[PDB]
Curated annotation (Swiss-Prot):
Gene Ontology BP, a term: steroid metabolic process
Annotated GO MF terms: glucuronosyltransferase activity
UniProt keywords, alphabetically: Endoplasmic reticulum, Glycoprotein, Glycosyltransferase, Lipid metabolism, Membrane, Signal, Steroid metabolism, Transferase, Transmembrane, Transmembrane helix
Tissue: Expressed in many tissues. Present in liver, prostate and testis.
Part of the intact protein present: 284 to 451 of 530
Glycosylated residues (UniProt): 36
Protein species of origin: Homo sapiens (Human)
Name listed for the protein in its UniProt record: UDP-glucuronosyltransferase 2B15
Length: 171
């Protein structure tokens, strides 16, 4: 692995991240297929995210979900790598592209994959077998299923321990 250092966040974004206190944050990025899917999918995701105490930064560019939580901010662009390096970061939600999984690995951030394409399926299945991720299919699963996965990856420290083992293979 090359090193993948983080820089500081934009000022307004750092302030939102700090507002999470001891709860910390969840980064959902890029989420690049969500806006080609139904309004319903986005609402189901938004419902799940609204039920955790963490603040959530969601890279998103569609219509605002009607079930958006007050804990969740929507951003057309994010500095994903900088967020993943932030000490407040507890979990990463991603479709499961290679680039963003390399960054999760480097920064030691466990994952909830929302895979759609073959390579994402494969990548997330590999992270899952390593103990570093859980997965949901947003086309078949419920808001509750995603919520349960989030709570697990956020709070059970063994997921983070398992992803940090992968950077030391890589280190």
């Amino acid at each position: 692995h090359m090193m993948k250092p983080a820089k500081p966040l934009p000022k307004e974004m750092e302030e939102f991240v700090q507002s999470s206190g001891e709860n910390g944050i969840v980064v959902f990025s890029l989420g690049s297929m969500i806006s080609n899917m139904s309004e319903e999918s986005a609402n189901m995701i938004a419902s799940a995210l609204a039920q955790i105490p963490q603040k959530v930064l969601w890279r998103f560019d569609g219509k605002k979900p009607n079930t958006l939580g007050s804990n969740t901010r929507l951003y057309k662009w994010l500095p994903q790598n900088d967020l993943l390096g932030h000490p407040k970061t507890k979990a990463f939600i991603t479709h499961g592209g290679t680039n963003g999984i390399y960054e999760a690995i480097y920064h030691g951030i466990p994952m909830v994959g929302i895979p759609l394409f073959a390579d994402q399926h494969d990548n997330i299945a590999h992270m899952k077998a390593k103990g570093a991720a859980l997965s949901v299919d947003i086309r078949t699963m419920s808001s509750r299923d995603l919520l349960n996965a989030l709570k697990s990856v956020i709070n059970d420290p063994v997921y983070k321990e398992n992803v940090m083992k992968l950077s030391r293979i890589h280190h």
